Design a protein around this nucleic acid. Structure first.
Lengths: 53, 185, 56, 129, 67, 70, 152, 132
RNA sequence: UGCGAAAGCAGUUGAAGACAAGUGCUUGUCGUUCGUUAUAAAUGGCCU
C-alpha cells in the first residue's frame, strides 16, 4: 500500500493497494468511500497475472 | 472554404480538418496560428484495391485529427480505419469494424484511438502495438466518442438506439476511464 | 380413444363440463393438428428432390 | 507468433508485436531497414515500417499492414532492391511463388506464378502406336 | 345438393351434420357422403403440394477445338 | 506453340497486319492465327495424328482463416 | 497467513466488489458467443447430448438469422449427423417445426450434391417415409378433434 | 401415346388452340409424361405454352376430378424449375399469382374436411354397432 | 406504395445532369436535380 499525492494538483490524494490478485484498487480522498478497481491491462494480460508488487 | 462535405476539430480546439469536393480532397488548417496548413486529394490516401471495389470502400463516414497535427484518422463505410501520417502521407490500416465506423477520436497524447460503430462496441486502439481493448454491449450504436479531461479521466459517448426507427433516441454516457463504468447516463 | 368416444357418445353429451375434464385430449390433439400444414410443406419439397434424382 | 525487436548493444527488448496467429517461419528486410516483412503458418505477410521521420528519431516500428496472398504456409521469403527492381518473393507449401513490391506492398499488384512451368519437358507423346 | 367460397359452404355443412346429431343420420345417405368427402380430401390434399411447389472433373474427356 | 497456360498456332506463309514485377532492363542481359487460354495449366501439348491434339493437364490441410458470410 | 478468516466485523467500512461465480458455460454456448456458427451446429449433434439442449442451438441459430451460414462448408460426410438427428427430431411435436425448417434449407443448398452421393439419397427416403407417417398421425388427430366437436 | 406426343409436338409448333385437348388425352400415363417433358420440351417457348394452358385450365377450375392436368403440372415444376423461372415474362408471373390464389383456397379447406371426415367415421361405426 | 386480417386485394420501379472505365460510341456509378402514393464481398465478430 502507499499514499499518492499528484505532483501538480496538491489537493489530489489517493491510496493504491494490491495483492495476489488480478486487480488493483485505488481510493480517492466520509459517509462512503470512492474506490476504483483497475482490472484491464490492454492486451498484456499474459505478462501480468498478479499486481502484488 | 467551399462545398465542405465533412469536418472535425482537434481535441484541443486548435486544428480543423475538413474535406471538400474541389473526387474529394482533405485539408487541415491551424486556427489560431499559421503553423499548420496542409492539403492533399483523397486519392493519395485511398489504396488501389479500394479503387477496384465498390463505393462503400471509398466513402468516408467519420474523420478525426490528432492534437499535434501529426496523425489523421479516416473512417470508411466499409469499416476500415486509415491513419495517415501528415508529414509524408503514409497510410496505416486498422481493420476490425465489420460495418461503417461512426465515431473516431484521438486521445490527447495521440497514442490511443477511440472508435465506435454499428457493433454497439467501443474499441480503444493501442497504436503503439496496434492492439485493442473493448467496451462491448453498449445500449446503442456509438454516434460519437471523445476523451474529456486534462488526463483523459472521462470518455464521453453518444448512443443512438437505432431499434426505434420512428424517432432518433439519443443517450449521452460519461464513462470513468479507470474502470470503464458509467459515471453519468 | 376412438372406441370410447363412439360407445359412450350419449353419456358424454350429458356432462356439465367437457373442456375441463378432457383438457388433456384437446391440448394433445391441438398440438398435432397445428403441425399439419408445416409437414405438408416439408413433404412437397422432399417429393420434388426425391423425384428429381430418382429420374436422374 | 510474436515479432520482437531487440537492441543489440544492450540485448534488451524494444518492441513486442503479437501479430500472427501461428509461427513466424521467416523474416526479410529492405535495404535501408525501413521495412520488416514476416510470414508464417497463418498464410499472411505482415509489414512493419519505421520509415516515418519521427519514428526514425524514436526508432519505433509500426504494424503498418498485412495481406493474405498464399493458400498455405509460407516457409521462405526474400527481398531484393535495385534502381530498376523492387521484388518481395515469397513461397511455401503451396509450391508456388508470389511476387510483390516492397515499397508498394500494401497497395501494389501481385503475381502468382504457375505451379509447373515446363521449361524441361517431363512428358513425350509418340505419334506411332 | 352437396353430393351433386366453397369454404364457408362446407363449414356450413359441418354445422348441419352436428345439429342433426348421432341418432338422426341414416346409413345409406351417409355412405354417399362418405364417398364424396373422401374425393374432396383427395383433391384437397392434391392442390396443397401443387401450391407448395409453386412457392418453391473427368480424368479424360473428348472435345473439338474451335479454330 | 504452347506455354505454361496458352496454346497458339501461327501460319508462317502470311504476314501480320501492321496497324511492374520485373527488372526494367535498363541493363544488358549479359555484361491464320489462333490463340486460346481455355486449357491450363499444361504439362505437355502435342499432336497424336493429323487431326488429334493431345493436351496434358494437371489435376493438403491449411491454416483456417474464415471468410465471413452473412 | 492468519488474516483470511476475518470478515470485517470490527471495521468502519465494508466494501465488496467480487462478482458471483456463474455456472460454467457449455461448449456450444462458447461457440455462439464467439460467433462460431458452423461449430455451434456440430456441437449440437454429439453423442450423449440432451435433446432439449440440442433443440436450442438450432433455435438460437435460426433466431440469430444464421441458418444458411451454418450450412455452407459442408459435404455428405459432415451433413449426415444433422439428418440423423432430424430423422429422430421429426417425430416429436416440439422439434417438428424446427426440423421442417432446417431440412428445407439443406435441400435448397445441396440439391446437386445429393444426386451424386448415394448415402444421402437413402437418408431422404427414410426421412420421406417418416414425415409421411407423421402426416398420417396428424391427420388422425384432426379426425378425433372433429369427432369431439360433434359430441360437445 | 406416341401418336399423341407427335400430334402434341406438331400443335405446339403450330400454336394451335387444341393443346388442352392433346394434354387432356386419356392415353397419357405418368411415366410417359415424364418421358415427353424430358425428351420433347427442349425450347423455352414450348415450356411456356404448355404451362400457360395448364395454368389457365387449373385456375379456371382447380376442383376438376380429372388428375391428368395436375399430374402434368406437378411434373413440369418438378423437372424444369430452372428453365421455368428463367422465363421473365410478366404475363407468366401473373398467371402464377392467380394459380397460387386458386390452389391455396384448397389447402385452407383440408383441416375442415378432415374434421368432417372424422365425424362421418364416427357416425358410420355408430350404425354398425346398432346393427349388431 | 395504398387498403386490409395475419391471409391477401390493387399499383409501382420514370426522366434529366455529371463523373469514371473501355473503345464520337458502349457499360457502371452518384455526400446532383425533377417527378410518381411509390446481392454482398479491404481476411474484416463483442474486455477484465
Amino acid at each position: 500500500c502507499t499514499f499518492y499525492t499528484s505532483l501538480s494538483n496538491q489537493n489530489q490524494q489517493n491510496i493504491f493497494t494490491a495483492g495476489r490478485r488480478r486487480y488493483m484498487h485505488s481510493w480517492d480522498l466520509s459517509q462512503t468511500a470512492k474506490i476504483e478497481k483497475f482490472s484491464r491491462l490492454y492486451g498484456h494480460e499474459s505478462t501480468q497475472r498478479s499486481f502484488e508488487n | 472554404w467551399h462545398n465542405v462535405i465533412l469536418s472535425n476539430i482537434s481535441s484541443n480546439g486548435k486544428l480543423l480538418a475538413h474535406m471538400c469536393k474541389d473526387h474529394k480532397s482533405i485539408s487541415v488548417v491551424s486556427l489560431f496560428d499559421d503553423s499548420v496548413n496542409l492539403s492533399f486529394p483523397l486519392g493519395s490516401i485511398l489504396s488501389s484495391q479500394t479503387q477496384s471495389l465498390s463505393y462503400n470502400t471509398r466513402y468516408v463516414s467519420s474523420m478525426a485529427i490528432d492534437n499535434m497535427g501529426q496523425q489523421l484518422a479516416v473512417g470508411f463505410a466499409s469499416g476500415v480505419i486509415s491513419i495517415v501520417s501528415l508529414a509524408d502521407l503514409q497510410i496505416r490500416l486498422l481493420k476490425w469494424h465489420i460495418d461503417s465506423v461512426l465515431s473516431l477520436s484521438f486521445s490527447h497524447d495521440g497514442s490511443y484511438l477511440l472508435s465506435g460503430g454499428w457493433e454497439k462496441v467501443m474499441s480503444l486502439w493501442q497504436l503503439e502495438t496496434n492492439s485493442q481493448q473493448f467496451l462491448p454491449r453498449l445500449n446503442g450504436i456509438i454516434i460519437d466518442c471523445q476523451v474529456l479531461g486534462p488526463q483523459g479521466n472521462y470518455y464521453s459517448l453518444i448512443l443512438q438506439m437505432t431499434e426505434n426507427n420512428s424517432n432518433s433516441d439519443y443517450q449521452f454516457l460519461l464513462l470513468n476511464a479507470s474502470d470503464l463504468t458509467s459515471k453519468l447516463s | 380413444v376412438k372406441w370410447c368416444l363412439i360407445i359412450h357418445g350419449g353419456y358424454l353429451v350429458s356432462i356439465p363440463n367437457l373442456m375441463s375434464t378432457l383438457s388433456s385430449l384437446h391440448s394433445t390433439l391441438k398440438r398435432r393438428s397445428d403441425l399439419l400444414p408445416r409437414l405438408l410443406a416439408l413433404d412437397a419439397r422432399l417429393d420434388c428432390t426425391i423425384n428429381k434424382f430418382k429420374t436422374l | 507468433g510474436s515479432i520482437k525487436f531487440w537492441d543489440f548493444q544492450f540485448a534488451t527488448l524494444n518492441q513486442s508485436f503479437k501479430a500472427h496467429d501461428a509461427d513466424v517461419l521467416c523474416l526479410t528486410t529492405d535495404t535501408d531497414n525501413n521495412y520488416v516483412f514476416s510470414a508464417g503458418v497463418d498464410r499472411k505477410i505482415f509489414q512493419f515500417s519505421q520509415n516515418t521521420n519521427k519514428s526514425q528519431k524514436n526508432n519505433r516500428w509500426v504494424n503498418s499492414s498485412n495481406r493474405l496472398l498464399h493458400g498455405n504456409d509460407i516457409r521462405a521469403i526474400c527481398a531484393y532492391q535495385s534502381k530498376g527492381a523492387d521484388f518481395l518473393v515469397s513461397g511455401g507449401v503451396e509450391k508456388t511463388l508470389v511476387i510483390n513490391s516492397l515499397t508498394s506492398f500494401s497497395n501494389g499488384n501481385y503475381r502468382k506464378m504457375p505451379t509447373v512451368e515446363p521449361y524441361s519437358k517431363n512428358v513425350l507423346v509418340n505419334k506411332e502406336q | 345438393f352437396i353430393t351433386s367460397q366453397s369454404t364457408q359452404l362446407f363449414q356450413l355443412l359441418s354445422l348441419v351434420l352436428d345439429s342433426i346429431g348421432l341418432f338422426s343420420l341414416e346409413g345409406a345417405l351417409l355412405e354417399n357422403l362418405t364417398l364424396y368427402i373422401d374425393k374432396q380430401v383427395e383433391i384437397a390434399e392434391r392442390n396443397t403440394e401443387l401450391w407448395n411447389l409453386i412457392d418453391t472433373l473427368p480424368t479424360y474427356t473428348m472435345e473439338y477445338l474451335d479454330i | 506453340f504452347w506455354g505454361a497456360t496458352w496454346i497458339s498456332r501461327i501460319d508462317f506463309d502470311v504476314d501480320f497486319p501492321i496497324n511492374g514485377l520485373t527488372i526494367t532492363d535498363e541493363s544488358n542481359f549479359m555484361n491464320h492465327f489462333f490463340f486460346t487460354d481455355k486449357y491450363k495449366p499444361l504439362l505437355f501439348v502435342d499432336l497424336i495424328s493429323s487431326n488429334e491434339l493431345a493436351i496434358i493437364e494437371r489435376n493438403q490441410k491449411a491454416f483456417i482463416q474464415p471468410k465471413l458470410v452473412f | 497467513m492468519r488474516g483470511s478468516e476475518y470478515q470485517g466485523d470490527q471495521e468502519h467500512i465494508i466494501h465488496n466488489d467480487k462478482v458471483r461465480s456463474q455456472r460454467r458455460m457449455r461448449a456450444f454456448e462458447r461457440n455462439i458467443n464467439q460467433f462460431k456458427w458452423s461449430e455451434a451446429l456440430d456441437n449440437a449433434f454429439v453423442p450423449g447430448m440432451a435433446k432439449e439442449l440440442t433443440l436450442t442451438v438450432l433455435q438460437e441459430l435460426r433466431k440469430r438469422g444464421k441458418v444458411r451460414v451454418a450450412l455452407y462448408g459442408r459435404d455428405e460426410s459432415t451433413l449426415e449427423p444433422l439428418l440423423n438427428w432430424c430423422l429422430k427430431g421429426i417425430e416429436d411435436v416440439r422439434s417438428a417445426s424446427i426440423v421442417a425448417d432446417w431440412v428445407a434449407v439443406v435441400l435448397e443448398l445441396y440439391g446437386n450434391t445429393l444426386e451424386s452421393s448415394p448415402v444421402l439419397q437413402e437418408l431422404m427416403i427414410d426421412l420421406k417415409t417418416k414425415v409421411r407417417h407423421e402426416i398420417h398421425k396428424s391427420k388422425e388427430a384432426q379426425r378425433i378433434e372433429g369427432m369431439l366437436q360433434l359430441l360437445t | 401415346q406416341v401418336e399423341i406426343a407427335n400430334i402434341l409436338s406438331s400443335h405446339l409448333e403450330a400454336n394451335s388452340t387444341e393443346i388442352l385437348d392433346d394434354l387432356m388425352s386419356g392415353s397419357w400415363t405418368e411415366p410417359e409424361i415424364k418421358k415427353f417433358i424430358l425428351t420433347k420440351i427442349n425450347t423455352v417457348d414450348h415450356l411456356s405454352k404448355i404451362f400457360l394452358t395448364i395454368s389457365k385450365s387449373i385456375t379456371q377450375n382447380p376442383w376438376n376430378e380429372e388428375n391428368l392436368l395436375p399430374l402434368w403440372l406437378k411434373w413440369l415444376l418438378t423437372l424444369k424449375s430452372g428453365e421455368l423461372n428463367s422465363i421473365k415474362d410478366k404475363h407468366t408471373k401473373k398467371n402464377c399469382k392467380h394459380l397460387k390464389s386458386a390452389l391455396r383456397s384448397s389447402e385452407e379447406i383440408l383441416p375442415v374436411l378432415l374434421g368432417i371426415q372424422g365425424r362421418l367415421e364416427m357416425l358410420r361405426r355408430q350404425a354398425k354397432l346398432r346393427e349388431d
